[PDB]
Symmetry: D3
């Protein structure tokens, strides 16, 4: 794997094996993965498969997705490696690529965010709605998402217009990065690097979640959370430090 490497080449090897083992899916795997020359082309194809509709032709969606910021494709690879690292249900890179709804919703949003920043708001709203119907995930096209993100299970995830997510964040299903008040402007959470958010937690308002903080499942967070702090409860309260500094751990290993 990538921790001991060509991601695209490994996905091709996993997929050709799956196609050989499952004749039911051979032509799906060949048309979605093997006939393509790059991971980005595969992703555009598979995402258009998911979100295409009578209104929005899969071919038209596929072309738009292919035409979409080479930074997006760098985030995609980081996201895939993050899932491999952090999700014990994932032992193959092609498993989230083809079958993890939260991975799909994140990458669909990245493209949606580009279309929205390009001024194609009606199209982005149409696709925001389609993502919510098909993936059970509602991300406002203006939300800004860093790389190395994992959205495990995904169902019920909500992130609003002014939400900002840093890098290497892990999020469970049912999580809300929600707004407060009836006025526009900054009103959704900003999440620092390294944060973990447990299932069905809510983070509400224009509050900051510090780097490497941990939000326990079921928490309702309505105030800032300092870096390296764990919060729990309804409403959420600091209960522990989420990570130990080297000076606290005193780990003397120097091998690796």
């Amino acid at each position: 794997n990538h921790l001991n490497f060509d991601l695209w080449h490994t996905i091709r090897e996993e997929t050709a094996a799956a196609a050989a083992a499952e004749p039911m899916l051979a032509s799906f795997l060949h048309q979605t993965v093997l006939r393509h020359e790059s991971l980005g082309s595969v992703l555009a194809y598979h995402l258009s498969s998911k979100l295409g509709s009578p209104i929005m032709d899969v071919r038209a969606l596929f072309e738009i997705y292919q035409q979409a910021d080479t930074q997006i494709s760098k985030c995609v690879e980081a996201d895939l490696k993050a899932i491999y690292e952090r999700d014990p249900a994932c032992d193959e890179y092609s498993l989230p690529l083809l079958y993890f709804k939260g991975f799909h919703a994140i990458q669909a949003h990245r493209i949606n965010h580009r279309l929205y920043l390009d001024g194609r708001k009606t199209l982005a709203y149409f696709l925001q709605n389609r993502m919510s119907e098909v993936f059970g995930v509602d991300i406002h096209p203006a939300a800004r998402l860093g790389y190395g993100l994992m959205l495990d299970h995904a169902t019920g995830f909500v992130a609003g217009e002014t939400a900002v997510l840093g890098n290497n964040i892990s999020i469970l299903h049912g999580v809300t990065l929600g707004g407060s008040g009836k006025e526009g402007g900054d009103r959704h959470p900003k999440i620092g690097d390294g944060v973990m958010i447990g299932a069905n937690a809510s983070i509400l308002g224009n509050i900051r979640i510090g780097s490497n903080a941990k939000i326990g499942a079921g928490s309702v967070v309505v105030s800032d959370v300092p870096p390296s702090i764990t919060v729990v409860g309804v409403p959420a309260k600091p209960v522990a430090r989420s990570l130990k500094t080297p000076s606290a751990d005193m780990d003397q290993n120097i091998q690796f």
Copy 2:
């Protein structure tokens, strides 16, 4: 807008013609869903049937059923208009009336339910149960056809909303995704919440049993409410306790 000026239908058409001009690949969708029609109700029946049509019941048949149900009770479309105005007022992500009309899952689920409720009360329970399941699959929203919903309702995001058979909702209520207006016990009879006017319910809160929520109460996100809530009280926690609204949408629970 409706707070400044106002013709809701004409504003929607003007917004839609603008969208079609800007996004030519959506132009025919917008012309067929909105601009070719002559009333808001016909647009709603068309768009809802596009969402919920399936092999079992195709978009054409559902369109005719929806037009017939709307025609049988002209007040449904009145609640539709009130809901659209409520979303415009209360949701800062909404600056155009046609945005919830066309793209907000919670708006579609609520109006789909109003038609289901009409069909159910007409005695068409099997059809209403089919459509309840269809709404749950497509929108992620489970509303029993017997539930009674007022006007000026906003269901933001919508995913995971549940309201059961004996639930009753007043007017000008605001609800977030994940909210449960759920039952208790294995017996029939009144067993679901009754929600007063002006109430706001935060994300993933649950309200369970035959209990009353007083007018203008606020249910904090993540709250679990199992007993009556007096008017103008704010409750937070699991179980929820009084500690301190559909118009203001303030989500603070501290």
Copy 3:
């Protein structure tokens, strides 16, 4: 007439309910005839309806139907679980007064039975197919159950939306679960890491049960609880985090109900 007051054919009662619905609703008559009345068994009906739900251009409904039919034929315990589930929903859900209502229209019943077949496909080594269907189930039903999760009989998953059960989750028999419930994992390592739920448990809406913990038989998890430690039998737990707050059962010695009829 029902399974609680008649010495009772589930399949024939479902056929009779369906013939009645078809005569009352011409809009749905041919669906009911193709999905229910033209079939010879409840298992064939279920395989047909489920493949209708999860089929796609990728996965032909006819092929899925045959796969589901063969899987039901390969593991006849599944159909017995199916029957127990329908009776459980009839017994416990006051919105259910007919057996064909959950069979045709309750998404939580569909997701459970789709998983039972999915689990069989997984055990037979069709893991790619099982992962494809896990994803399809999550999309169509809003329910994410790992194919390796183990589910007993007499289960009710009411409303269903948002239910999650992970790779090493185990559910016993006669369990009742509301929408939004999580039987979730902890940590980045493989091995046993999801809850094991004993017989008779009730789990309320949007509760989360996390880690390799045991929920004892007849326990009750209140709506919205977050459970991160073992829960002993016959205990009710509430809160975030969840704490024991009461005994879950009323003993006959406490009730003093003297009826013998």
Copy 4:
């Protein structure tokens, strides 16, 4: 009972035939209820069924249905032609013993009525739409009729496959046409260049009638003929090229049929 022996409601007879078919064939009951029985008029049924045939992802069936309904409402002569056609098929086709059979299942009847609406759309200036539908008709029905072609009432196009009628073709009333017939043009120039067919004509299978020629009333074109010159009334023509070979009608003075009952 029918239109030849009852002083007769076409629409209500069609409803009665359809209710009978729906009760006998549960596979088709909901189609018959959605296509026929839930409607209030034959024109609404026709618009619904035709849009089912010619609709596509490009052209939403619901939009086409409304366009066809408005076109039928804009030109109430079309529905009168529709009724004449159904009676003509009942009278002349021995395979037809029920009025709803061509209405629902005869491709030549569908193509003719689709053209009548197509012609109206063309005259109103919706030429792009009419060309789109001309192509759709050719694909789905195997029938190519230019939107500018003019068709009278009481027409039967039996089997239909391969029928072609070009831009300046004109068909009178009470004409019978078999599959494979061509009312075709000649030359690379615009202007009148297709046949004009008089009342009462019969045209046999795979005949071709080419150029700006006139086929006189009550003429008969035998199957397989190629007609490139005018044909006078009451004449039968046969061959490649076609030549007059007989008189097409038996006069009462020749038959000497003395019945007065």
Copy 5:
């Protein structure tokens, strides 16, 4: 092949596995249509239902109807096998048994008709009329369900073929596209041709009325036949005249 060796079903599977290996985007189609099945009849029911399925009657329902009809008369599949062998023998464009099975419109129309005929004789006339129209739309072939077809029949290209209510076809007949076995008159009763064994009919020929075509006659392309044709006679022209066969497929008319 069946003239050299022979197992038709096994040869079809071997051909199909070869095709799937060569054309990976068709592999799942071939596995789902052919290789997953255990008999030729089940493949035919599956593939015909893929062709004729529609919103009114979906591929699944038609598949079950077709399997039931085939199961009710095991001789249909016998005629299917004879037809496939006839096409292999007589059509130089056919060097594999699975090519007509999967890709020849005329083969599909004929087998679709055999099922229609069974349904029609069972009394399911409405369903048979629906499928007759469906066959006409999809295949360009109009065969009345009451028509009687023998075995070893080949309909090459098929487009425009018409056979009416009282038509009767013998065995080992070869027919090209555009051929009419048509009626005459406005009255019921026998009014369509009866075709003897071994007859060959060229492209776009018509045979009209209650007339008999003798065994091994040859009908030239473009012929119009309105009276009986004796056995082993070749006729050409409009109207057709004797001037001088399903195995040899010689199209000369001079």
Copy 6:
């Protein structure tokens, strides 16, 4: 027009006008024509729209059609100009491109012929069948078709495995270029340049049709036809010269 020129540019102008006049079709015209950069890309898109099916994804067909011999695209343009010239029902180039089934069947065959020559016979047979179902046209993938062809109406056209067509030929619906005998090898007609074939004519066997010959509608041709000859009847017989030499016509015009 091209007789008094950019074909692709004229089609774009015709199509933008049609889109402006017909809101029902605006997004179809935009997705099929206007969003593309070349006529070949439009043709690949529209053909895949016609022949796509559940088995054969429109995206997969579109990619294959786009990947398909830059001579094919030259024939396409010649075919479009031929229809404009010869068909009085055609006064716009985009009319046959989008709505003439015979134009579609010919171009679909050209691509099919390339796939077949590349050895993808199963795919070509699949598409031959699909063309026959959707267009009512049966052309064997091995048939070789020249440029400047017009197939007017198209329904019932049949051309077999060894048929060869030259350039600037005009063919009506119902025409058969058919084989004879049960053996392989050359057994279908070879059609010379400039030929016209009328409706429902049949040309059978390994016979040669000479350049600028004319086959009357309803003819059955079973022997060679010399250049510049018109044949009529069942069976067909020479009846006239089809074109006049300059020496026969004595036209003295020298203007144009």
